[PDB]
Amino acid sequence: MKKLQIAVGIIRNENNEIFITRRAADAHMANKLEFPGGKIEMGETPEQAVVRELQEEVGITPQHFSLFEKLEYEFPDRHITLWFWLVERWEGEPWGKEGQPGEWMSLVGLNADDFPPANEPVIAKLKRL
Ligand SMILES: Nc1nc2c([nH]c(=O)n2[C@H]2C[C@H](O)[C@@H](COP(=O)(O)OP(=O)(O)OP(=O)(O)O)O2)c(=O)[nH]1
Ligand SMILES: OC[C@H]1O[C@@](CO)(O[C@H]2O[C@H](CO)[C@@H](O)[C@H](O)[C@H]2O)[C@@H](O)[C@@H]1O
Ligand SMILES: [Mn+2]
Ligand code: NA
Question: Which residues are 8-oxo-dGTP-binding (predicted)?
Answer without folding.
Answer: 23, 28, 34-37, 119
